[PDB]
Amino acid sequence: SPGIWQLDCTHLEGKVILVAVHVASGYIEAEVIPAETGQETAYFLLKLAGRWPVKTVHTDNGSNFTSTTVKAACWWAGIKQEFGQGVIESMNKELKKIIGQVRDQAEHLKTAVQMAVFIHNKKRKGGYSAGERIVDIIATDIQT
Amino acid sequence: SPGIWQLDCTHLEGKVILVAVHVASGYIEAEVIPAETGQETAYFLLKLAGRWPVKTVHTDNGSNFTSTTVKAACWWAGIKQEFGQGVIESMNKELKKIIGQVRDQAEHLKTAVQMAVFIHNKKRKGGYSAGERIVDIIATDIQT
Ligand SMILES: c1ccc([As+](c2ccccc2)(c2ccccc2)c2ccccc2)cc1
Numbered sequence: 416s417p418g419i420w421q422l423d424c425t426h427l428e429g430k431v432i433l434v435a436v437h438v439a440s441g442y443i444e445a446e447v448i449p450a451e452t453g454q455e456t457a458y459f460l461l462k463l464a465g466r467w468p469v470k471t472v473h474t475d476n477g478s479n480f481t482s483t484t485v486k487a488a489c490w491w492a493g494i495k496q497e498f499g500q501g502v503i504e505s506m507n508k509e510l511k512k513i514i515g516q517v518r519d520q521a522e523h524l525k526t527a528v529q530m531a532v533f534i535h536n537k538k539r540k541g542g543y544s545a546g547e548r549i550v551d552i553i554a555t556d557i558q559t
Numbered sequence: 560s561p562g563i564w565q566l567d568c569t570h571l572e573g574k575v576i577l578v579a580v581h582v583a584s585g586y587i588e589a590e591v592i593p594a595e596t597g598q599e600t601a602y603f604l605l606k607l608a609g610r611w612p613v614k615t616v617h618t619d620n621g622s623n624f625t626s627t628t629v630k631a632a633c634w635w636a637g638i639k640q641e642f643g644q645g646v647i648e649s650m651n652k653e654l655k656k657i658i659g660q661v662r663d664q665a666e667h668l669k670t671a672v673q674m675a676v677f678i679h680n681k682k683r684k685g686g687y688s689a690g691e692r693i694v695d696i697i698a699t700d701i702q703t
Pocket residue numbers: 519520521522523526627628631632635
């Protein structure tokens with residue numbers, strides 16, 4: 416299902432990392448956020464939905480989606496919560512693994528996170544990359 | 560040329576808006592940044608290059624790309640500066656136009672910017688939208 420995304424937060428170095436995964440492809444979008452709050456979640460959701468066709472979002476922490484600010488962002492962008500596993504578990508530990516490997520390539524964690532996203536999305540696995548798969552899935556979906 | 564992006568900053572309400580446009584499609588990515596600095600430009604460049612295949616970036620303010628931090632981000636991500644107009648002028652005023660129209664739909668400007676990106680990218684112009692065009696262009700490019 417091409418419009419389904421998974422969104423969670425993880426923690427590293429006293430900071431919070433919001434990680435979104437496009438389920439059908441394994442492509443990730445991530446941001447280091449200053450605090451685990453509804454405001455940050457809502458702003459990220461609105462940003463993502465303007466960049467990719469987001470129809471439903473799943474999470475492993477349902478409480479992350481209860482705040483008025485998150486519900487208003489889902490309302491405006493027309494997102495609904497996905498009510499129904501292997502891919503997502505493998506992308507987050509793999510993201511932390513890649514972060515660990517490039518941590519010394521930047522001063523700040525936020526920089527290393529985006530180096531990790533870049534490596535993850537371009538890594539051919541075979542054997543296309545997640546980046547190649549999301550664009551194929553969406554482009555195929557557009558054309559009927 | 561599918562890997563070319565244009566990046567500039569604009570100003571509204573005492574704030575700075577970084578606007579990136581994928582030249583061949585008119586798709587936009589934008590962020591309200593706290594300051595017009597090399598650090599913010601570099602972080603945005605690294606983020607963008609992990610999400611789309613960025614080969615060259617053009618700007619209407621060449622000085623925006625001279626800081627060690629921006630050059631290091633371009634080095635790491637393998638981006639080069641594009642050395643060689645209608646589309647970009649039409650997207651920024653159009654973004655400010657859409658922002659003006661939704662400004663009262665959110666408290667903060669940063670929220671309205673991302674509502675404006677969302678509307679812009681989904682607007683069918685015919686007659687596909689910029690979002691549809693970038694995915695078609697990239698997916699076509701991948702497959703030879
Ligand atoms: C490999 C080696 C060095 C960096 As550099 C850097 C800065 C502090 C500690 C360790 C590495 C870097 C550039 C941009 C953003 C984050 C880190 C770096 C290396 C050479 C010239 C400029 C910057 C990246 C990859």
